PDB file of N, CA and C and ligand atoms in Angstrom:
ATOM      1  N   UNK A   1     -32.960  25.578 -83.607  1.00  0.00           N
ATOM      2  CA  UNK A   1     -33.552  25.205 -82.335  1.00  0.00           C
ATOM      3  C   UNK A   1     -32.579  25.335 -81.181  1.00  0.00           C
ATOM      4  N   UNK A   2     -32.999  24.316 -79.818  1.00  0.00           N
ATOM      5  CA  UNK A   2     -31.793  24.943 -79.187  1.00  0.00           C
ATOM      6  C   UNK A   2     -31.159  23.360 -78.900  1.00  0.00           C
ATOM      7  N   UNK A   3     -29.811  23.902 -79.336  1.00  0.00           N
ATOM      8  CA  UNK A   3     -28.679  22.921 -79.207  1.00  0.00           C
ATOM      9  C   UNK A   3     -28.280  21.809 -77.844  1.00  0.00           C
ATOM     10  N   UNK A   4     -28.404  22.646 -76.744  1.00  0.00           N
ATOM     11  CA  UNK A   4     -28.144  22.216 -75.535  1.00  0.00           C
ATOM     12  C   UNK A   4     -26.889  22.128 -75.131  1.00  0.00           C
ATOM     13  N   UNK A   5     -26.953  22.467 -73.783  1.00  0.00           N
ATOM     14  CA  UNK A   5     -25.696  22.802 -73.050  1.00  0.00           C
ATOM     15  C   UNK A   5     -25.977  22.119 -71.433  1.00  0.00           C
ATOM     16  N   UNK A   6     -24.828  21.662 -71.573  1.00  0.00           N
ATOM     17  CA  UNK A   6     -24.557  20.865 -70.172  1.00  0.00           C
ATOM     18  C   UNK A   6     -24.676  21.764 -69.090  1.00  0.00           C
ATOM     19  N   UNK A   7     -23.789  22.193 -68.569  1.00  0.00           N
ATOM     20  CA  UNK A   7     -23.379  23.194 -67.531  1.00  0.00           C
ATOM     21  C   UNK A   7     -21.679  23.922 -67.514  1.00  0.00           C
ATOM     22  N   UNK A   8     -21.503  25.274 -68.095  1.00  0.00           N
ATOM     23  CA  UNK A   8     -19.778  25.314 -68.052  1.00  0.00           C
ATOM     24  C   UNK A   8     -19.598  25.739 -66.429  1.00  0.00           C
ATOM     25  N   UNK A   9     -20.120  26.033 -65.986  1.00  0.00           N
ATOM     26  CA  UNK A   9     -19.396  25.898 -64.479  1.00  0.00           C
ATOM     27  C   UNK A   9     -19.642  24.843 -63.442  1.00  0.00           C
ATOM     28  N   UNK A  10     -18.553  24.833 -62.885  1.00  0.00           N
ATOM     29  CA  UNK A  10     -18.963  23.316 -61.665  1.00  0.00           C
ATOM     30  C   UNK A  10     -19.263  23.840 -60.659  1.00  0.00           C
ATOM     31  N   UNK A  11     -19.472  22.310 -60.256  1.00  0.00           N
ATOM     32  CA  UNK A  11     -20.467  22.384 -58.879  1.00  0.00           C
ATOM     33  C   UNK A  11     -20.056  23.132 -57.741  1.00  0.00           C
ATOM     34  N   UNK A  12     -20.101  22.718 -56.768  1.00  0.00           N
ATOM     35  CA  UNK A  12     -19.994  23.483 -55.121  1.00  0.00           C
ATOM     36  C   UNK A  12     -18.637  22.379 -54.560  1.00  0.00           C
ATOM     37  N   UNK A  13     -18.039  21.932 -55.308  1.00  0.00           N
ATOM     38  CA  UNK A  13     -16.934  21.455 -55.251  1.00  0.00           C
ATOM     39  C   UNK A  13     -15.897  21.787 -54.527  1.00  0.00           C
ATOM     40  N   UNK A  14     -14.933  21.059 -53.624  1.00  0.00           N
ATOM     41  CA  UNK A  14     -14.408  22.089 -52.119  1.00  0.00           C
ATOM     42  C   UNK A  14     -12.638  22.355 -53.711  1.00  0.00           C
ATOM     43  N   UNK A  15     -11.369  22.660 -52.836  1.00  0.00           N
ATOM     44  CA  UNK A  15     -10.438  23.104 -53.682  1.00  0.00           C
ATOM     45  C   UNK A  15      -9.502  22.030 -52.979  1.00  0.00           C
ATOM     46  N   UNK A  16      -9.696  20.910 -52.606  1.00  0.00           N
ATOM     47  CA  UNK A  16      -8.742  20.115 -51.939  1.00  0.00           C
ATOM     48  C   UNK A  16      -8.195  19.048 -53.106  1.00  0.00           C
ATOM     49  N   UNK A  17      -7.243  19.233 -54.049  1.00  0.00           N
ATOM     50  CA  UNK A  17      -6.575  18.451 -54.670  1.00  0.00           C
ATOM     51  C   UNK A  17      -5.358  19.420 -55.602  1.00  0.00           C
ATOM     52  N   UNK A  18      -4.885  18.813 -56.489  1.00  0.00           N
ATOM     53  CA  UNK A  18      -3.438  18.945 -56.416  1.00  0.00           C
ATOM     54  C   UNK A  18      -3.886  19.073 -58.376  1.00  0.00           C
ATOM     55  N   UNK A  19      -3.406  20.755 -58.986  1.00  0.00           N
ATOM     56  CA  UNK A  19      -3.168  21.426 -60.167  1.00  0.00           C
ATOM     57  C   UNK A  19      -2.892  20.384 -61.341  1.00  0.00           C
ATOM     58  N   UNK A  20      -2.065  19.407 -60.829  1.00  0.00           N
ATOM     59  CA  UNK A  20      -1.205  18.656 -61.817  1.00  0.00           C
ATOM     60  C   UNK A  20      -1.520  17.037 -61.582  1.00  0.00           C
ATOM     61  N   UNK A  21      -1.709  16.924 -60.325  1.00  0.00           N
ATOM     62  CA  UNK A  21      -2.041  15.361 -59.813  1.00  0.00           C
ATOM     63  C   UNK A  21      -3.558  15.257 -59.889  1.00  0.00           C
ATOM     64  N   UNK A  22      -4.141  16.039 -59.841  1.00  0.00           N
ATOM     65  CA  UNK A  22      -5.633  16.274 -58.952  1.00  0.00           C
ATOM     66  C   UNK A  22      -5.592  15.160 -57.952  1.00  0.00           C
ATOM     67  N   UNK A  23      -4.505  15.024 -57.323  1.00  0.00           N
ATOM     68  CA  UNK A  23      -4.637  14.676 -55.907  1.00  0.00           C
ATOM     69  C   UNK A  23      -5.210  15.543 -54.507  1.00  0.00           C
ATOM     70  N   UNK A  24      -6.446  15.039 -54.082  1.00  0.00           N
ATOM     71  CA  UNK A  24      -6.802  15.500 -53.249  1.00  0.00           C
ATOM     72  C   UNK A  24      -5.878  16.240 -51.811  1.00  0.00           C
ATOM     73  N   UNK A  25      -5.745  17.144 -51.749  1.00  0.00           N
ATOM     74  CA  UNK A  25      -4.738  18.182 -51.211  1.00  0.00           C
ATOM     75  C   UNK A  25      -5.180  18.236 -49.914  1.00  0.00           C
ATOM     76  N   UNK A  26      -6.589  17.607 -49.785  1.00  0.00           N
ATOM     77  CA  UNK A  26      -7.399  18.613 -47.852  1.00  0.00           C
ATOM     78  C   UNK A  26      -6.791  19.596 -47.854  1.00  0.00           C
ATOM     79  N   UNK A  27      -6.868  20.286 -46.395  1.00  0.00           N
ATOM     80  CA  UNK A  27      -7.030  21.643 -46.460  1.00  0.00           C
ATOM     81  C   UNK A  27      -5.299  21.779 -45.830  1.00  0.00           C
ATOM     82  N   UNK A  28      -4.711  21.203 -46.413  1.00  0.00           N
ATOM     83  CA  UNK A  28      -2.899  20.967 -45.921  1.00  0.00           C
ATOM     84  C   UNK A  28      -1.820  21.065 -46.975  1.00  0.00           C
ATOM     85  N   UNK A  29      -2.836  21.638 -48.642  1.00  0.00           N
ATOM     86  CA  UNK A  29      -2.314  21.691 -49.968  1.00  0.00           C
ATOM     87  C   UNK A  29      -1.082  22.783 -49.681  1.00  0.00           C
ATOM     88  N   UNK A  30      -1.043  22.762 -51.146  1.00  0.00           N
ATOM     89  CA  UNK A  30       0.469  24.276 -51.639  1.00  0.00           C
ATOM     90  C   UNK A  30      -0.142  25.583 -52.450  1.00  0.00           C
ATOM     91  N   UNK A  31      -1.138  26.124 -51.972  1.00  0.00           N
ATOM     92  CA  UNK A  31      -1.755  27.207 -52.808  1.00  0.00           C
ATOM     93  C   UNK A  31      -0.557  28.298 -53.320  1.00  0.00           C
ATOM     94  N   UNK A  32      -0.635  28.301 -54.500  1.00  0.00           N
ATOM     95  CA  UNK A  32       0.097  29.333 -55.555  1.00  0.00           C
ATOM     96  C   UNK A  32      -0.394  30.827 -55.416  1.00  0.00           C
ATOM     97  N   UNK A  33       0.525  31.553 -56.093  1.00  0.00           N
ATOM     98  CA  UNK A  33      -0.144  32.805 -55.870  1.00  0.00           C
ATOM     99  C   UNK A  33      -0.759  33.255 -57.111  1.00  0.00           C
ATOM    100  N   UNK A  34      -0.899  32.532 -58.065  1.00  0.00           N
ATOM    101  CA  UNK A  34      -1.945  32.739 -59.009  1.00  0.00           C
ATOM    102  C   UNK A  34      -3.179  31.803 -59.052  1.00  0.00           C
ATOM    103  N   UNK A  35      -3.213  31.286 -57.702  1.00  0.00           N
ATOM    104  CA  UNK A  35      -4.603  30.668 -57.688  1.00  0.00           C
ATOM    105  C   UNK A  35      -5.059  29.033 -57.613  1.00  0.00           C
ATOM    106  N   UNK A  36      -3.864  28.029 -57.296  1.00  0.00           N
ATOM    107  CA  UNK A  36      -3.857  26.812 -57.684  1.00  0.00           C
ATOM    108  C   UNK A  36      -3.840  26.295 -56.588  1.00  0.00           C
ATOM    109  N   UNK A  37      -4.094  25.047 -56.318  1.00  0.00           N
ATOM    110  CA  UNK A  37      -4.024  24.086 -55.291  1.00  0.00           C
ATOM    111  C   UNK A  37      -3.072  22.837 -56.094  1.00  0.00           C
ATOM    112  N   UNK A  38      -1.990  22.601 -54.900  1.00  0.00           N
ATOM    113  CA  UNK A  38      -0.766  21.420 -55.403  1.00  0.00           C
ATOM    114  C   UNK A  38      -0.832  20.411 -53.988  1.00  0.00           C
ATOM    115  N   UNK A  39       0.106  19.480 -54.363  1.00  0.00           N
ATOM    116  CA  UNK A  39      -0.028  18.530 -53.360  1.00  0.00           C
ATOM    117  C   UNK A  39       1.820  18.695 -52.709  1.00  0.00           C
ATOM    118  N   UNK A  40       2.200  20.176 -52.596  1.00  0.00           N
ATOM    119  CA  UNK A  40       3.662  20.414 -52.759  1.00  0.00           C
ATOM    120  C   UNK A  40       4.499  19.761 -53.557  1.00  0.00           C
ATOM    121  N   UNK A  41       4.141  18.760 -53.885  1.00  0.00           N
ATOM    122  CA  UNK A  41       5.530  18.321 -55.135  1.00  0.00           C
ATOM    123  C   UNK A  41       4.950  19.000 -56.335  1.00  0.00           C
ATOM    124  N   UNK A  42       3.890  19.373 -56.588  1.00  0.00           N
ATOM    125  CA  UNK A  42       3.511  20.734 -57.909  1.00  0.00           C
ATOM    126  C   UNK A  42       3.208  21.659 -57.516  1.00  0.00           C
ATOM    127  N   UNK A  43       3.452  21.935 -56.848  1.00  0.00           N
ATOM    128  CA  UNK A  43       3.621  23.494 -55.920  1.00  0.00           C
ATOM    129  C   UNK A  43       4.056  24.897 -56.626  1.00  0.00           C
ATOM    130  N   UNK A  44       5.206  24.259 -57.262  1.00  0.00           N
ATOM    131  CA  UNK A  44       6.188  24.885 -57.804  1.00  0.00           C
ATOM    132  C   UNK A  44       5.319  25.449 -59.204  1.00  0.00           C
ATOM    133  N   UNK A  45       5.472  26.598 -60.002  1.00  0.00           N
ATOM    134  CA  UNK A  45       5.311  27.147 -61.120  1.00  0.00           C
ATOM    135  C   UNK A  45       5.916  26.559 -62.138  1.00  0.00           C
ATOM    136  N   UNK A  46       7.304  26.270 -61.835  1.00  0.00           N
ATOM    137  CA  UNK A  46       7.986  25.411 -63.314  1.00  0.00           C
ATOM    138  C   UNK A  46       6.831  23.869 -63.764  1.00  0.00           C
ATOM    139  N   UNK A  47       6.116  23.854 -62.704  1.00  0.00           N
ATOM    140  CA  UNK A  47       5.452  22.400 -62.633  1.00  0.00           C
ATOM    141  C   UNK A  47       4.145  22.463 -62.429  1.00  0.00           C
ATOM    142  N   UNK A  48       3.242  23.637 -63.232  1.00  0.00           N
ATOM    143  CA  UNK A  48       2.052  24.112 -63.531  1.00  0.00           C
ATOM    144  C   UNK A  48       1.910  25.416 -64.029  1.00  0.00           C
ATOM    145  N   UNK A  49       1.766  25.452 -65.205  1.00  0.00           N
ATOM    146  CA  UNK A  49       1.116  26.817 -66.173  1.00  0.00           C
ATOM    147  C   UNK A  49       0.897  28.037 -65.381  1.00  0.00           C
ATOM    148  N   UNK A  50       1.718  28.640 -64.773  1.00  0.00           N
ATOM    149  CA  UNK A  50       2.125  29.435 -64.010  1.00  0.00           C
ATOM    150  C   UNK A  50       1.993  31.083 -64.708  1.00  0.00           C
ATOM    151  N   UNK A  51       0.714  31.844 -65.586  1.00  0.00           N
ATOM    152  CA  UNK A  51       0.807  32.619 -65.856  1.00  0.00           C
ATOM    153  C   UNK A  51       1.543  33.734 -65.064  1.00  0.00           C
ATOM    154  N   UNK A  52       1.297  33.975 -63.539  1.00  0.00           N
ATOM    155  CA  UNK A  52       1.708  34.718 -62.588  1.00  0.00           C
ATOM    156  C   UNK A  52       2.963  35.113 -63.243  1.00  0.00           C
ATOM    157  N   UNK A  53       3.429  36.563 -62.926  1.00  0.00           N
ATOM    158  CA  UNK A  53       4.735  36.825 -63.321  1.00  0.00           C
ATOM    159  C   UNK A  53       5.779  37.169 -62.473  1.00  0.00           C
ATOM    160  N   UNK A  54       6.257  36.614 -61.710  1.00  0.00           N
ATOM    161  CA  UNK A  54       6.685  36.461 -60.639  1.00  0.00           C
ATOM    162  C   UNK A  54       8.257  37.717 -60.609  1.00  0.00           C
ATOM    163  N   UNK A  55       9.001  37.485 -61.532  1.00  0.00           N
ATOM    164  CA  UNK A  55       9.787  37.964 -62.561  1.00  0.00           C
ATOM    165  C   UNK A  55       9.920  39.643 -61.981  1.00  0.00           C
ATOM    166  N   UNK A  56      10.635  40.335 -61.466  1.00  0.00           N
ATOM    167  CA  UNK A  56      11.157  41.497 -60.881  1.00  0.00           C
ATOM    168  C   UNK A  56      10.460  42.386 -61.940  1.00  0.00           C
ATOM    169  N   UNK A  57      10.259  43.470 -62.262  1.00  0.00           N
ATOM    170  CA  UNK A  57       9.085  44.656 -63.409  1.00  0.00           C
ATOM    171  C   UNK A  57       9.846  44.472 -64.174  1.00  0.00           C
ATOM    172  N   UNK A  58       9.270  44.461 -65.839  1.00  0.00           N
ATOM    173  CA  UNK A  58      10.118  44.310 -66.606  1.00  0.00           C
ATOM    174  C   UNK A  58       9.248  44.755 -67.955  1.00  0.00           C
ATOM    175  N   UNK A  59       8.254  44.058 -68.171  1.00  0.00           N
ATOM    176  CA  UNK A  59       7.181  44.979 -69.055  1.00  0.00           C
ATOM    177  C   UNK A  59       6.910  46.078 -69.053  1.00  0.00           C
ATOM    178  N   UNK A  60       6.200  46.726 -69.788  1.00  0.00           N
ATOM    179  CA  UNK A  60       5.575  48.231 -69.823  1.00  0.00           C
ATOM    180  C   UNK A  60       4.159  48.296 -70.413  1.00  0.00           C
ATOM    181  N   UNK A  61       3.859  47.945 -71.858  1.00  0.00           N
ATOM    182  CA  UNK A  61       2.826  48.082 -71.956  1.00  0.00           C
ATOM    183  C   UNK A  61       1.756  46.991 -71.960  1.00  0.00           C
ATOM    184  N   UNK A  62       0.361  47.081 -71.534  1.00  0.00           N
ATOM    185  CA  UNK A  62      -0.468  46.579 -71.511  1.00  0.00           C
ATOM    186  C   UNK A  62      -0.243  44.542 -72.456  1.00  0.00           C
ATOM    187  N   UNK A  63      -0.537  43.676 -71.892  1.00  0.00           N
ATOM    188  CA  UNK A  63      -0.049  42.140 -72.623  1.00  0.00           C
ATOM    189  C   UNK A  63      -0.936  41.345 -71.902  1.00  0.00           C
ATOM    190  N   UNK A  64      -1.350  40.212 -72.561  1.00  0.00           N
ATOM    191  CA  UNK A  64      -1.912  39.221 -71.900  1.00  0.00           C
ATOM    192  C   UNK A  64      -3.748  39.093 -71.555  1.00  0.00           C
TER     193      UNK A  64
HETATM  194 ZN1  LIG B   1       0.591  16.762 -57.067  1.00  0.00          ZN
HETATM  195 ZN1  LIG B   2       1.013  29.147 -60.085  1.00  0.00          ZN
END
């Protein structure tokens, strides 16, 4: 039959809080360049799952 499912995506939710705190950030946060909202003290990559590879070229083939 059917199992049921909540919803996997959220709502209309604004991006004002903080990666690591989910402290609400308003629109005065630390946006990352892989996509995050911080409250500047997690701003930083060492201090959120920072796939981005920030890292000078160094790979070659296809990863990730
Ligand atoms: Zn924070
Ligand atoms: Zn990041």
């Amino acid at each position: 039959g059917s199992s049921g499912s909540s919803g996997p995506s959220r709502p209309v939710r604004p991006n004002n809080r903080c990666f690591s705190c989910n402290k609400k950030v308003g629109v005065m946060g630390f946006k990352c360049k892989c996509g995050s909202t911080f409250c500047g003290s997690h701003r930083y990559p060492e201090k959120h799952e920072c796939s981005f590879d920030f890292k000078e070229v160094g790979s070659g083939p296809s990863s990730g």
